[model samples]
Structures are given as structure tokens and as C-alpha cells.
Target: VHFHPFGGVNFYEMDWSLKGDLWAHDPVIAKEGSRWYVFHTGSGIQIKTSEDGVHWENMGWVFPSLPDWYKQYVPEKDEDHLWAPDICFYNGIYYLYYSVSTFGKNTSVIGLATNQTLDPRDPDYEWKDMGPVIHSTASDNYNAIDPNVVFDQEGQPWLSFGSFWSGIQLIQLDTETMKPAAQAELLTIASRGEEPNAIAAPFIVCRNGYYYLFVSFDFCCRGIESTYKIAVGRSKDITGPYVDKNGVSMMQGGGTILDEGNDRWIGPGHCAVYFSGVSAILVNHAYDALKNGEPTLQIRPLYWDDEGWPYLSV
Candidate 1:
């Protein structure tokens, strides 16, 4: 029997098994009307949509080609594929954050694009390149990619990003420009402790009274050989001293395992969390060991424990 907590009058009436166009990686989700859209890493940031959250269909590409300006940030970028595009609706506009870089290099950038409407059929549907928000060079201790934006309880916007260098970073953003605040200081919030940290994909979400920091650890892109796993930590403050359930600081390589993947789904990582009314869902991609290591989309209902920690039912 399928059960969903958000059923109108019967909690057991809703089904949760997802189906349809599920090919994607590093996907971020947004909703307009009854339609849901997913923007992810690929040629010009691949686009997909669905009427119900369970099923999806490929729409097309956000950019027909790489933006000419991206060369200014990552001169070594050799492909049109961008990485980890994050989408969030704020202040009457949809903000899309994406990464530009070559593999195994610290030189990278986080670029931004804004849209008036998500619907491509809308006359106003256009993604305007707002340019790079932040970048990192080899001289820098951090690698800038996988950006996630969250507003604090005070309505202050913050961008939390970074990967495999000095770990996850948090920076304050100016409301006017939606970029890093002029006087903001780069703060490290999570790391793996060893050389080349091996942690990345910083996603922050606020719930109840705590701010949860989600990250992917180890390697990705190796298909079934990938060791990627989704883990998390939380803090009361957005600028955190985030700690795992056992009180180990995230900066010390501590995180509570949220999804480690099974034999069929080898490596699961790069996640996003979305809330609708009283229901919450965790969205990510995993390599299918049974399917020649294909990276396929996965969505599961998220639940909070009595003690306020988040978990997946299965």
C-alpha cells in the first residue's frame, strides 16, 4: 500500500513511486503553476519539466551554447557543459546559479542568470546572463562551484558554495545586486580534513529552528566506481559551526549519512531539498549499477525525526 502524509483526508491514498524522463545530474527544482522544472548540469544546462513531481520530461537546453563571457572566468573551459545549476525564486525573479570549470582544477567560477518567468511559452521567458558571481584561481585555497542560496531568518540572503579544496564556504550577499556583499568575508563551514578535502556541493536549507547543511562527499562521475554519498550537518545559525548528530563539527569531516546508495544504485550525491506545504522531498541522482552506470534522477520523501533530524523513509 502506498502512503503519503499529505493526502486530503486519507494519508494512505497517495503513491510515491516516481517515473518518466529521469535523466539528469546536479538538478535543481522550481515550480510555476502546476508545472515543475529541473535545471541541471549538461550542454547549456539541460532543462526538464513535469506536471506531477513523480514524472518528468525533457524540455530542451537553457543556452544553445556556452556564454562568451564564461571564458573570462575559466579560460581553460573546453566544453559547453556547465555544472550544478541551482535555481531559486526570489524577489519576483528566478535566479539560476551555475558553475564553469575544467575537471581536476581549482580554477572555477560561479555564474548567475535571471529569468522573469520559468515558462518557455511565456513571452517574457528569457534567461539573461548576469555574469559571474564569484570565482577561484589556483592561488586560492577554495574551489568555487556547486552554489546554493538560502535566506536567513532575518531575510538576509547568503550564498553557500565550494568543492574539494578548503571545503564549503558561506558568503553574505547584497539584496540589491544579489551578489556577494562588498564587505563580506569568505567563511569555511565544512571540510574533510585531508589533502584535497574531498567534500563539495553545499546546499543549505532552514527548517524549524535549525539550518541544515547538505553536501556530497568523495568522488563523482566514475559511474559505478563513484564513491559519492549525501551527508549533512546542522546549526542554529546560518553562518554555522555545523555539527553532525554526534556533535562532530562539519569542518572536521563530520556529517550524518543521509543516503549512501545500495548495490543497484552505486553512488548517490549532489542533492536538493524542496518543501511543499507539509511535505518535503530530497532530490538527487545516482549511478545505476544495473544500467551500465547511468546517472538517473531519484526523489524520495523526507521526514524529520522527533528530535528534529531529517531522514529518508526508505
Candidate 2:
């Protein structure tokens, strides 16, 4: 059986075995008509639909047919190594951002695709590949994978993407085209030992004039050996001088722990925020130690203390 740490507002439990089988990561939610769509990554991109955020049924892969560009990067027997993907409806279209790279220390690339409808079942539905949006060469300062995009108050879209190359890198994206307008600027969250792994999966959220940048700290993708947890920092400006409770700026290597420690769930990273009224929730995936490294989906309610710091309840 599964359980939620907050108020028993069960986000998952047993009979939801979709958690164990295929590896799933980076869940982004979308609603169409009255159904909720969950998009994730693993063997390939998978989608599931539900009416009330529970009792989900697999809707099938996000792309039933691979695009031509996917064929170029995808190996013959290797298939398309789809990493954590995030989808958002902007203007009148749905934009999908994904990583075309393997896990671990390997270099990576970020790509974009678009579809006009949320219903993948629609015969008219098709994913038009936008090709590579960002990539890292051997000489670059950052890795180009694990992307999360958000638009600031200025209506400019900014993309936060990277893992273990040189912390998280931020770049200004064109609001109309959703493409990078300039080179990525590094946001020094925390060092991952001699390398930087503490700052992976940079997700941004804004509330009450402050832009919050959340990152997954510690190691990830070691299956059972993963020690990943979530951490955060914020700034008044979108391009940040983000600081934690200790008065250390993120640019100067500082962040506050949002989720951590070993309590059964391990490597909780790649999050998407779902906001409703005054509350927000985090949806991500974690590998279960009891299940021998099998990844399971996890969701937790977010709370803000009087000090204005954001954290997960459990």
C-alpha cells in the first residue's frame, strides 16, 4: 500500500502498481475538458489520464510514432532514450521539452516539440519536432539535459536545465518562440563533491513577487544507491541572486533543504509544481529501496512557513 505523509491525502497507494514496473520520472500535469494528463519519461514518454488525480489509466505513449529527427539521434536497437520531459500549454499550443541523453555523466541535449491538442488519441494530434534547443560540447561549462521551463512576470520564458556539469544553468527564452535567446548563465546552487550533482533539475515558480528556484540536491540515477532529495532558493528578480536561510546567495553556493534523509523513498528529483488557489503540490518520482531500485511515483503537499520558506510536508 502507498501513503501520503500529509493529512492522509493519499496521492498514491497499492493497486497503483504503475509505480513499480517501467521507470517513470519528471511528471508534468495537464488538464483537458475534465481529465488530468500525466506525462513522464522512462523507456519512452508515457501518458496516463485520470479524472480526480487517482485511479489512473495508461493512455499510451506520448508519441505513438517517432519523428524523423528522433530517428537520427536514436540508435537502431537502442531506441529513443527519452529523459525527463515537461509539457505545458502556452498560448494555444502544447509545448513539450525533453532531454535526448543517457543518465549519468554523459553529455546531453535538450529538444522541443509542439502539438495543437492535448488528446494524444486525436487522429489530428501530432508532435512536430523542433530539433535540438540546447546542447553541451565537451568544452562547455554545463550539461544540456533535465530541462524545466517557466515564464516570468515580464512574460519572458526562461529555461533552467543541467545536471552535474557545473551546477544549474539558466537562460532567457523567447516568449513568442520559446527558444533560447542567449547563452545559458550558471546559477551556483551547490557542488556535487569535486563535481556538482547537488543542483539538478532546476524548476522555477513565482509567488507574491518572488521567483523561487527549486533544485534536486545530492546524487541521482544510481537506482538503489541514489541519495537524491529536493532543495530550493529564491530571489526577487527572475535572474537571481538566490539566497537561502543562511544568507548565502545561490550564485555564491547556497540553498535550503526541502526534502532529504533516508526514510524508504530515495532519489526524489525531477519535480513539476501544480498550483491551486493558495496551495501548491509537487509531483515527482523516487526509487524505492524495498523494491530493489524500482522507481515509484510520489507526490507531496507543499507548505510555506511564516518565514516564507517552501518545503514538503513529508
Candidate 3:
């Protein structure tokens, strides 16, 4: 339960790249050309930009106002804010999937927007809303939020989303249209097993020959009292029976703990993973205990063990 300054997500020997305007929550990262962008939860989907992935500054918002279609999914309000968003690049386009919903409500919607470039100066830079990809009402077993689009080993795209009702759900996508294929089957990927399923934010990374599923466990958004932590499981197949290092299925709340956080970086959750050549990065938000429980953006180094399991070097 204790770590030296260098042993956790603190500012010691950890190769931390954070300093300028670091306030952020539920963050996901993107790299278009040489510049980096961060998309996170906000009133209009807040964005951050950096010339070098290290020093970041608040840049812009994706939408001038909430989309008219989002009102069709949830009870629209004047102060409504967008939630967790995931970003990925494929075939010369950036696919940004975002969520719209009220707190702890199953009546939610997941939507997509695409842009030809991340730089605002580019003439082609535009996030065209592709409309609702999927939605859930009071009847469905899952809440459709926190969308993460991951491609399989075969390069087929899939969307993973969930909240309190169910653990996580997945659907195959029609890459051409970037939406769920007609008649596609839905699969319940992971769950907490117990009642009041306290899980959300499902992010998948295909490493070596396995698909690693990472999720947030316990409660978030409580500031200093938040209990958010990161856990993970892996399977050889994309549609999986993923298990933690202890050989227990994720369906029953089994996962290896990658990080929970120290006293300073409290309640870390909503993570995104990125790989480049031989190195990888883990990006997420943790409430800053020193800063009046402000959600702060954090980027940490991701290292793999000889057995191919992922861990934060901190």
C-alpha cells in the first residue's frame, strides 16, 4: 500500500511528461502527423494539443453545441457535457467515438465523428458527425457509453462500450461505413460478477498474439473519495473469455492490477493505451489530491513482462 516517490505515478524518476494546462478527465490521445491531440470529457468535448507530445495546452472543442441528434437519445439540457471519447486512425481518417448520457443512467448514446486531420489550421480539418452508432434506453441490459473502437488481428474494427448495468459489450463494425454491420451479434465481454456492477471504461490493445482488455473498477467522479483503479485481462481471440494472470475469467471480476495510484494521484481511471515500434504509453486521468481534487491528465510508460502481460513501470 506504499510506494517510494519513484515507485508509483508520482513525479520522481518516473518519465512523466506533464506540466502545462494538465486539467483533464477521461482522456484519450491521438497523433496526427507529428502533432498530438487529447480528447476528453467536457461541455462540448474539450481538446488539447501539443507540438511535442510532452507539453500540452488546451486547444479547442469538437462541437460548437451539442448535436441535435444527441437530444434524441438523452434528455437534453443546456449545460450537458460530452463524456469519455476514444480516438483511432485508419485508412487516412481519424475515427473519434464519443458518448452522451446523464450520470448513472442507462439511457445513453454512443456516437462517431470523423476528421481528415487533427490540426485546426488544415483546410480539411473537420469533425463531421457520422450520427449515433448505437444507443440504449431503460430496457437494455447495458448502458452505451465510453466507446473504444479496437481492431482485431485481422484489422476488423469493433466497438466496446458499457457502464454500471453490464460490464462491457462489443459489436462488429462495417469499416466502410464505420458503424455496426447489419445483423451483427452483440457479445458481453466483461463484468464485475457481483451486484451494482462497478465497472466502466473498456480499452483493448492487441499485443503480440493476445488482445489485452483493460478496465476501470470501482467508483469514479467522487474527487478525493474516488476509488477508481485499473485492472486487466487477456485472451488469444478478440471475442474472448479473457482472464487475469491468476487464470480467472474477467466475467467474474478477475483481472491483474496495473495501478490504483498513490495518495497524490488519487482515483486513476479512464485509460487509453498506445504503441509505437517497441515502446508503449498509458494515458488517463487521476484526481489530484493536492489540487482540490481536480482531474489531471497523466501519461505513463507501459512495459511488458517476459510473459507478455502489461504493467506500468511506476
Candidate 4:
């Protein structure tokens, strides 16, 4: 419902409607010069550019249709649906990791694509599909959605990806290729906690010698009937034993509650964080349960306490 600017940092937020009725979830952030690009995967994949993080300009579809390789992997009946995309820049090229499978279904797969620049005005702008980077068979219990990539201090790239089936999964990737180097390690982030809920969408960020994992817990995609919030756990190492203030490991039921549901906000999940000097800001979407049957994009300033935990002013 609100977008807050920090320290006179020029940013803009924009509203973009998708092709499908479900026009929420999956926000990927890309920064180019003074402009920022946000990619969302709803009906197809849509891009919205912003000079500042608060105002936005709709740039329409990044890829008009699903790639032939994606359709081949997906059956003829279910040929569409591109969910959750994460964009990262490594070595001057922008790499986009996206999911090409049905929600709640284990047949989902993560695909990769690369582009030189997000700005359409650039002469070198073109998205080259790299096909599925990771896939899960029907027998596999875990669904491969929400792909996030982060680089460690040693300049090594690691990917954190997963969904309902087996918690959050992390895989070591080749920094040059942006592909998995070995099998992924499974990590348990958030759980039902004496209740029956699902903790999904893991966003990993590294700042000031600490690797912080921001997770969106609870339910999503329920339209006006959603209940979700954001949580956090930090570790000295990128592949952590991430724990909270109580010293409980994030893998063993430990996380700092960043932001939960407010009076008018419902299911605030699938988030991305960026730094402006020493400050961090969170960009997420919340379902407007009372007004209509759609989700609204939201951005809030992140304040760190004395304990180095991120908090939302809302």
C-alpha cells in the first residue's frame, strides 16, 4: 500500500497487471544505471522499469511466449504457466532463473536465461534461453520453484531454491556458467510451528560480512484469502547453520520474524531486498483481501536494530 524512500535514494515503484487473473507473486529486481527493472511471472513474464524504486513504467513482456524446450518438457495440456523468477548479475551478464512447472505439482523445473542489459533501448538487449537448470520428476517429493542466487565473499555463486515438498534447498553453482556444480543441500527454513502452514520463498542477501536469509512463511496464491509474512535468519557463512537470537539453527526451527500480517495486509511473501549504503529495503506484494480479489505491490524501508536484525517500519 506504501513505498518509502530512504536517505534521499531515488527509487520508484510501479503497478503492472499480468495476462492471467492471478497477477501477483514473483518479483525479480535488476539495476541498470539509475534505472531499476522488476520482472514478475504471472501469466507470462512481465517487466516494469523504474527510475526510482517508488514509481514504475510498464515495459510489457520480457518473453512473449514460453520457449519450445519448456513446452517440450511440459505436456501439451499444460504448456503455459511461468512461475517465480530470480534475476542476478554475474560478470557483466544478467542471468534470469525461472520456474516452468505447475504450482503444488512436483513436475516443476527451474530454467535459466541470459541478457546483456535490461533496458530495451540498449542495442545489445536480448534474452537467450538456457533451458531448465534444475528439474524434479514426479517421484521426487520436492517442488523446484523460487530460484535465488547469491555470491559469497570468495566469489563463489550458490543457489537457494525449493518449495512445499522438502523445505528450502541450496546448491553450489559454477560462477562462470551459473549452473549447479554438485547436488544441492536441503535446508529447513520455516515450518508450521504447532499449526498447519507452509513456509516458502527464500531470498538470500549478503551484506556487511553477514549472509542473511529472508524467507516468506505461511500461505500464498489464495487471492483475498491469504495469510503470509516474512522471516529472517543470519549466518557468518553463506551455507549456514543460520540461527536466530536464541541460538536455534534455522535448519532446526529458528528464524527472526521480520514482518507478519497487519490489519489490511494479507500474505506478504515472495520478497527481494536491495542495499542503499548501510540501509536495506524490502520489496514484496500483499493481497488486498477487502477491496478486491488481487494482490498489490509494496515496498518498505528496512531498519536494522542493534542486534543486526532487519525490521520493517510498517
Per-candidate TM-scores read 0.95, 0.85, 0.94, 0.87
lDDT against true structure, model 1? 0.86
lDDT of each residue in 1-314, candidate 4, tens digit only: 01111333522232223222224466866677778777887655777777665566667776777787766555632645577888877677888888887655767778998998878899999998877787777787566778888877787787787776656777788877798855655554544343333666888887667888887777888876777778888899887877777787766557777777676878788898876555566878888767574776666767777777788663
Off by over 4 Å in 4: 1-23, 76-79, 182-197
Compose the digit string of candidate 2's lDDT tens values, residues 141-208: 77877788877877777788888767778787776778885554545443444444456888888877
How many clashes (backbone atoms < 3 Å, residues ≥3 apart in a chain or on different chains) does model 4 have?
10
Score each candidate by Cα lDDT: 0.86, 0.70, 0.85, 0.71
- Candidate order, lDDT descending: 1, 3, 4, 2
For model 2, the local distance difference test gives 0.70
Pairs clashing in candidate 1?
A: none
Better of 2 and 4 by TM-score: 4
lDDT of 1 by residue, 2-35 (tens): 1011222221233557678888889888877768
For TM-score, the strongest prediction is 1
Model 1 TM-score? 0.95
After superposition on all C-alphas, the RMSD of every candidate to the true structure, in Å, is: 3.7, 5.3, 5.5, 4.8
| Better candidate number, 1 or 3, judged by TM-score | 1
Cα lDDT for residue 39, model 3?
94
Window of ten residues with lowest summed lDDT in model 2 = 1-10
Q: Residue 45 CA error for candidate 4 (Å)? A: 1.1
